[PDB]
Design a protein around this ligand. Structure first.
Ligand SMILES: [Cl-]
Ligand SMILES: [Cl-]
Ligand SMILES: [Cl-]
Ligand SMILES: [Cl-]
Ligand SMILES: [Fe+2]
Ligand SMILES: [Fe+2]
Ligand SMILES: [Fe+2]
Ligand SMILES: [Fe+2]
Ligand SMILES: [Fe+2]
Ligand SMILES: [Fe+2]
Ligand SMILES: [Fe+2]
Ligand SMILES: [Fe+2]
Ligand SMILES: [Fe+3]
Ligand SMILES: [Fe+3]
Ligand SMILES: [Fe+3]
Ligand SMILES: [Fe+3]
Ligand SMILES: [Fe+3]
Ligand SMILES: [Fe+3]
Ligand SMILES: [Fe+3]
Ligand SMILES: [Fe+3]
Ligand SMILES: [Fe+3]
Ligand SMILES: [Fe+3]
Ligand SMILES: [Fe+3]
Ligand SMILES: [Fe+3]
Ligand SMILES: [Mg+2]
Ligand SMILES: [Mg+2]
Ligand SMILES: [Mg+2]
Ligand SMILES: [Mg+2]
Lengths: 161, 160, 161, 161, 161, 160, 160, 160, 160, 160, 161, 161
């Protein structure tokens, strides 16, 4: 006849503080990566300027989309993101991007390292995130895949022979 | 040459339990889509337009979801049943009420029914994943998208 | 201000209980049709699978747009639709769609019959709808036209000449 | 040449003065509605501003397309529209829209009333239009349907249940 | 199963021979119009060539969509269209389009007359069509409206005021 | 830290004169749009189609213009009045005539009324620019686009 | 300066034979388009939908083709005649039958009539090419596209 | 004949002070984008959806703006700094508060932060305009677009 | 403060065995694309058009898949080999037969070849998943998409 | 097995005479584009708008054409020269007159200049075709497209 | 009551000969830049060929759009542009582009200089244009901004460290 | 009266075995080029990586479209293509692409040579194809033109001064 549930209030999945903190770590590194990516995009000069200028904007697009995905995943699971500038600066694990113009070769090396750092944060929190919520780990997989692709597309400029 | 011979390589086939598990997800997705449209038409009051619009996006997602699940069943040699009698008789979702409903009531009602739908997917997840990880990925997309819908809808009623 | 009306409140056209009832009958058959169309879409097998699989989705798209149109027309005229599963199952005039895989030949005949039942419901209510509100009768004409087109496009598969 | 007519000049269907007059009445109320819709769009303030601001532009889009449709239908049938500011102001049946900023609650009620007055004009002329030219009555059905949809979408904001 | 019908076969609405005949008359005039429209499109020369050349293609697009609509409506209602060259030539009511290059002034008058003849055919069959099937009459309204718009857009070139 | 404190930083607000100046531009833009449609429907004769089409582009521009100006007013705490009575009572544009009008007449009539509209914007420009340069940029777009429309329309009647 | 003087450089003009040759291609293209629509509406039976859809693509191509040829005629100072009487009286295509026709019959009928149309283009090709190679390129596009249509349609009836 | 004979002609160079002025605009645009996203995620309550959506539109505009300014800097051989430390250390915007915030609070908070960003642009405007009018036009685009966002957002809390 | 201090931090490196596993997937995806095109061209008979079209959809998916796998290899510093000799020498797929083939035969042939490709992905899945879960998700996308293609194609020959 | 064993195989090389032939086409296409824009700006009178619009379509085609020719030159290692001095010094087109010109005059002027451009292509055609048939096909595209433009434009002045 | 003006003829803004001449100077340099940009686009060879090939086409697109904008602004203000090849060659201030293939490095330097020259013309005429017509100066600002952006995007290839 | 042909069966153009074999030669080289192009696309590293990565994908797109065009032309003319991997490997005339990563400079040289080889096959079979069927030769012209353009766009990277 009927399999319908009777509750007037069915709660959603609530993330633990640890899980919330793990997604927060991913978030600040994705935002920092986005900010560094734009810095590089503006300030790269030299041989093959245009390709890097353009590829960096694609990296920024992906990182911005990723940061929105992570922050909104946090919101869906009743966690509260902090993407404010002071928090990002105080808590990012990425080495700082240097000031002023940088050569194409240096930008390639610098950004590759910073992508590598961002991915490392995602890989570090992965198993804990997966254990609590496999659906969030899938979002992490997309970020890993997308960012490591960016790393290859950027770094290959400096790879010799 | 590493070429195989077999002129009849059969596809991966779902166990009856696996098919039954996807059938559970399917009816709740269809029921959610029907309830979402009902809410979409009959919601009234403060912030009507936002709710009206958001509910349709929920329905879009839930419909795409039901098709995905039903066709995954087909791919794995299982047979979906999305007929009205079956949905009404087997859905775990609390019945959505008839008639006009306030935006505040619709927010609470629909959030409960999304959560009910997610709960079904979360209930079958581990058994699905154990048999076929590729199908559990489809479940993850569903969980992610619906829990996003719950957040976007319920936030309307959130106080301070 | 010459021809301007001075009423503070000007009320809209309100559907009679008979009118509301008549559109409700159309609504449940459109929704039932959509549900059966998907069932057929998923479970059809055999000769010319792909064409039928594709046409059935087009039928479903039209029936879904149709049900939304009718339900929203009800709302516009201060009537209240009921498109819930229990109501559709309990009140649809469509012959039940069978379970399990069905041959393309079977599906063509089954769906043609169910489309025709849906159109019949619309044709049955048409004159009473038209008498109260010509504008709504026009929406019914769209449905009759579009559904009868679907019936021709599907049924022609089984036609032997 | 078997069934071919041999007339050098075959004249088109020409609207009667009554018909032309009736479409003119629809035209001025559609234009007045568009103008008031923009006024409301600009000057609405308060709770749920954005939704109302957006819906009012959709109303205006529909009313503008509607007025163009009516005026061009007049032209097609050898009638002459007058959509000039003085004429619209002097001959519209719509209650004047108030000046200054208006609350969202106020705007909902005000615009619902003005939409309803516009629809009333169309409903009043409908039968006389339909008697002379069924094809034009169909354009009126489109307007009635679309405007009553707009009224429902707007008015529902103020509905307390 | 409460309100569900139990008929194995539910047949669709079938057009009478009179109805089928009436739509066939519309069909041949729409196709003749399309053919003449292309002839005019290609062979028009003189003052305001480009505008006429372009408008004639829009007329042809509408007439082609119209003929497809009518023929498919026939099919939907178990009637059989005949749009073959011999049939169109033998049974069209349109005055023959002249051969060779034609001035823009000449083309405006010629095409206006042929559009009007096409609309006349639709207007002549309208009431008999509407009496049997209101849904098809609505398709006729679309054709009347669209073709009379075309006539206005074309004929206005030759209007001296 | 260079961070400011103030929890209530107010926006730039237009003087009454500034608001009045934008109101002047607004009514002429709306009136032009209404006259443009009137011409669009009622133009007849040689080169009807081009004029019919061009007039609609004029109307599109003038409507986008009126919205831009009215919303700029809103941004600066001014209140537009685009109602029919106000437009008829306060527009500086010579009245467009009723009834069918020849393409040659429509070209001359509409050119005059575009020029009237541009003249209003040119009349208020310096006072607008002195108070708010950002708003004068919107005026420049209007001047540029409308004077383009005048050229595209009037060239029809240009002899040799 | 390598600038020429001539204030009246005339265009390439087609001989009467060339115009007559393009006229031949034109009527067969128009007739094919009319027969294609007839088949599109009246085809019934096994695989109706594919045939119904493919026939419309044939018609699209044939219509674009007829316009291309007729306008090429215009470019070269020739005058097309695509009127119904002329098409019926001068087309080389076997008459398409009235009434409902099976998909199998429609495949055979339409293939024959496409081949008839291609044959016309192939018949006039060398004479067209000798006078104007640029026009023969248009003929090649027609041959290529129609022979593709023939393959896509006839393959339905191909046994083993 | 009128051709200049230098093998390399130099482009326009921004003074370092001009560069510093655009840098002030840049950091507040970036700060505003970051705060807008914070608000976009964390806003809850009555009319959540409209605010959530409008805040993304604000961020889109602010991100486009910061790109425009940074690339204008580069065109004139100034060197932007949009790094997190620099933005945090030098922005004039009041810090956005942590945690969930009501729609009413978000409206007032974001309006103030938009108004602060506009204030920076208005403050540097004249010094920028004096050196390079073309850059001032970009500033006008920002003032116009941001003040529009301020109106669109603050209107939610306006009581009349 | 929390910033890491290495000038160069290394990314994730795939073991050569992991690389070899993706290489197995790659060659079968490329082989499947090549066979799918062969079938697409050479299929004849009843329901030709649907098969012709569906086979192109399969090829689109397989080509996108092989690109995804090859680029995942590159991301992790493995080196793909999609050259014709390598594909022919190392594919596990049964060879596709030459010449025209009936729609019924093509359905059975292509279903088997899809099933072989899926089998390869399923065979390497666990070893891939153990080293890099993110790559396994790409494998799941392929399994899901290919098994869908298998169902869509094989359904033609299913008799119920 | 059938693989060629040269490490570098040379591509097809255009003779310098072939290069010079395409160069003749190039300068007249560029000249035509420049004159077409001149006419586009300066045309006045009866049916201004159609001419203004058609002239832009001509220019679009001529610009696409000149790019096609210049890039064909580069493909075959010829080196185009589209510089203003070279175009002015070597074009075969009669100079376009200065100042405003009536629509009737523009029609006749532009038709002649199109016809001159076509004449150049037709003049070099056979020498181009003899060396490289693939390039001649590009010439055919130009002849066809330009002769279409000639008909579309000149038809305005045709009296029948 | 009424604020309507009474003139049957209201003239538009007419540019002085000096203003007309100033826009003419901008026009010939924009056209020359477009022609040189295509020359460079075709004939650039060497390291980073593709990026420059592509960026040069974007420069050409902008310069062509700019030349149309300036010429049409002239037309709007009753001035008469001259974009003919002989005039452009005789009156452009740009140094001539050299013949034959050029290296990527040389093309970067050459084109940067020619953009710089084009912008200089716009900057030279600016204040005079602005004094007479501020709305035209705004168009000049767009050209300056757009072209200096192109200069940066092109020149950065050759900028070292 | 009537020019209609009387045959119930009109056959299409059938290609000779030689013609079929000539198109087969073009086909295997186009497929081989596509496979080598993707290999290069994945494995190119070094200075100007991105441009080559991207340009190679465009080459692949063109070659794949070309191979479909040739195979389908064969089908239209009753010939039977063989694009299977073993056939392509056994019968392609292209030198083999080397294994593993290759520098940008080496990839430019290698791919240019392989395009040159592919075009050479098309040029070798051209006159024979043209003699039998001029319409197919036109398709060959498009391939020659499109591929030689790719060759220029790729090779220009390595061309010095
Ligand atoms: Cl919204
Ligand atoms: Cl036009
Ligand atoms: Cl299909
Ligand atoms: Cl690029
Ligand atoms: Fe995933
Ligand atoms: Fe997983
Ligand atoms: Fe009716
Ligand atoms: Fe209708
Ligand atoms: Fe300014
Ligand atoms: Fe040829
Ligand atoms: Fe501007
Ligand atoms: Fe060609
Ligand atoms: Fe978001
Ligand atoms: Fe589906
Ligand atoms: Fe809806
Ligand atoms: Fe209109
Ligand atoms: Fe059709
Ligand atoms: Fe607006
Ligand atoms: Fe045409
Ligand atoms: Fe940028
Ligand atoms: Fe790729
Ligand atoms: Fe190019
Ligand atoms: Fe232009
Ligand atoms: Fe294909
Ligand atoms: Mg590059
Ligand atoms: Mg809202
Ligand atoms: Mg089929
Ligand atoms: Mg015209």
């Amino acid at each position: 006849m009927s399999a319908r549930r009777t509750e007037s209030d069915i709660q959603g999945f609530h993330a633990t503080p640890e899980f919330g903190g793990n997604l927060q770590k991913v978030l600040v590194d994705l935002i920092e990566l986005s900010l560094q990516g734009k810095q590089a995009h503006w300030n790269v000069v030299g041989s093959n300027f245009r390709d890097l200028h353009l590829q960096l904007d694609e990296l920024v697009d992906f990182a911005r989309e990723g940061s929105d995905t992570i922050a909104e995943r946090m919101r869906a699971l009743d966690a509260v993101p902090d993407g404010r500038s002071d928090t990002v600066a105080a808590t990012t694990t990425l080495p700082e991007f240097p000031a002023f113009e940088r050569s194409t070769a240096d930008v390639v090396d610098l950004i590759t390292t910073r992508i590598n750092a961002t991915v490392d944060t995602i890989r570090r929190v992965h198993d804990a995130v997966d254990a609590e919520d496999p659906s969030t780990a899938d979002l992490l997989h997309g970020l890993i895949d997308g960012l490591e692709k960016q790393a290859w597309l950027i770094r290959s400029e400096n790879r010799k022979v």
